[PDB]
């Protein structure tokens, strides 16, 4: 997942988490505007190993952390499917749940037989039980760090998003929290690109000087 712009000499590769620091406010604002307008502008080009350019629908752009809605129909659906898989991996728990659901179905069936009208039904499944329970992620009481962590957790659930990008999101988190975010990103394998005006001390990052020189920086 390499990104390239006219200011760079060679296209830079983004693997796992990547911290890109732009020391020039003009190039930074122009790059962010090229990130929001990316479908319209041909200056900023992001391509994969196949050299194929990714669509703006495949690109995931995030600026406001607490304003973004983490709960969506696809995210909640795939999450319920993941929970159903977790319950399916254990035979004993699935057997017990099947027993309880069988009892409830017996009760409701008796109540249906007691009625004068002819009534038919099918089944009460586990996905219907989860949908009836209303399982969803809670962002209401979550701190910004837990919000970005939940975003990194649900990025695997998003199928269409090729790359996640954060705009000036590293100013809220402490150095240790940034270390946790990067170390978790290495395990999640997702491609995350952070854009900051000022460099963060203690983490590996790519620095773009006002001279428009891109250099790797360990600190």
Partner 1 sequence: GWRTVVVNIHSKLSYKNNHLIFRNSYKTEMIHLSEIDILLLETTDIVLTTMLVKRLVDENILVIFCDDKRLPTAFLTPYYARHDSSLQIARQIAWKENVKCEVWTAIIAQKILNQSYYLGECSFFEKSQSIMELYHGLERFDPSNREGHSARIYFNTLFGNDFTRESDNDINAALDYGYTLLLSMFAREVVVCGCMTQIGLKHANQFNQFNLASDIMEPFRPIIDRIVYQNRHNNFVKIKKELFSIFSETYLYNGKEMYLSNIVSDYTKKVIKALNQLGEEIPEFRI
Partner 2 sequence: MRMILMFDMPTDTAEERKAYRKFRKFLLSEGFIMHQFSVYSKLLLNHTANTAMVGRLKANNPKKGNITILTVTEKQFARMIYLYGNTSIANSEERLVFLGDNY
Q: Which stretch binds a second copy (CB under 8 A): 10-18, 48-56, 58-66, 205-213?
A: 58-66
138 is in an annotated binding site: yes
150 is in an annotated binding site: yes
Residue 211 in the binding site for partner 2 (CB under 8 A): no
Cβ atoms < 10 Å from Cβ of 21: 19
167 touches 193 (CB < 8 A): no
Among 15, 57, 74, 112, binds a second copy (CB under 8 A): 112
Among 3, 54, 167, 192, binds a second copy (CB under 8 A): 167
For the residues of 40-101, what is the DSSP string, one character each?
Answer: T-SSSEEE-TT-PBPPTTTEEEE--TTTS----HHHHHHHHHHHHHHHHH-HHHHHHHHHHH
Find the binding residues for partner 2 in span 113-132 (CB under 8 A).
125
Among 117, 159, 215, 218, binds a second copy (CB under 8 A): 117
Q: Which two tokens stand for residue 97?
A: 């749940």
Q: Which two tokens stand for residue 94?
A: 């699935």
215 binds, among a second copy, partner 1, Ca ion, none (CB under 5 to 8 A by kind): none
Q: Is 45 left (phi over 0), alpha (psi -120 to 50) or beta?
A: beta
Whose CB is nearest to Ca ion?
A: 134
Report in angstroms how near the CB of residue 8 gets to partner 1 at its nearest. Answer: 30
Q: Which residues sit opposite 192 in a β-bridge? A: 17, 164
For the residues of 175-189, what is the DSSP string, one character each?
Answer: HHHHHHHHHHHHHH-
Q: Which stretch binds partner 2 (CB under 8 A): 86-94, 114-122, 176-184, 187-195?
A: 86-94
Among 10, 69, 120, 211, binds a second copy (CB under 8 A): 120
What is the rounded distance in angstroms from the CA atom of residue 64 to the CA atom of residue 144? 10
Residue 177 in the binding site for partner 1 (CB under 8 A): yes
Residue 8 in the binding site for a second copy (CB under 8 A): no
Residues near partner 1 (CB under 8 A), total = 15
Report in angstroms how near the CB of residue 6 gets to partner 1 at its nearest. Answer: 26
Q: C-alpha dihedral over 156, 50, 11, 197, to 10 degrees?
A: -20
Report in angstroms how near the CB of residue 80 gets to partner 2 at its nearest. Answer: 13
């Amino acid at each position: 997942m390499k990104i390239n712009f006219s200011l760079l000499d060679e296209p830079m590769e983004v693997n796992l988490g990547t911290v890109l620091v732009i020391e020039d406010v003009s190039v930074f604002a122009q790059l962010v505007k090229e990130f929001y307008q990316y479908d319209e502008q041909s200056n900023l080009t992001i391509f994969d190993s196949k050299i194929r350019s990714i669509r703006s629908s495949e690109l995931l752009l995030i600026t406001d952390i607490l304003g973004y809605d983490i709960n969506t129909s696809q995210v909640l659906k795939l999450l319920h499917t993941d929970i159903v898989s977790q319950l399916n991996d254990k035979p004993e728990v699935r057997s017990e749940i099947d027993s309880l659901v069988s009892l409830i179905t017996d009760i409701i069936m008796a109540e249906c037989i007691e009625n004068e009208l002819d009534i038919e039904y099918d089944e009460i499944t586990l996905l219907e039980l989860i949908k009836a329970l209303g399982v969803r992620i809670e962002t209401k009481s979550c701190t910004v760090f837990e919000k970005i962590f939940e975003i990194l957790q649900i990025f695997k659930y998003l199928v269409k998003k090729r790359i996640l990008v954060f705009v000036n999101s590293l100013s809220y988190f402490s150095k240790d929290e940034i270390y946790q975010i990067l170390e978790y990103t290495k395990l999640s394998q997702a491609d995350v690109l952070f854009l900051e005006p000022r460099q963060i001390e203690g983490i590996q990052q790519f620095i773009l000087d006002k001279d428009y020189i891109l250099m790797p920086y360990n600190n």
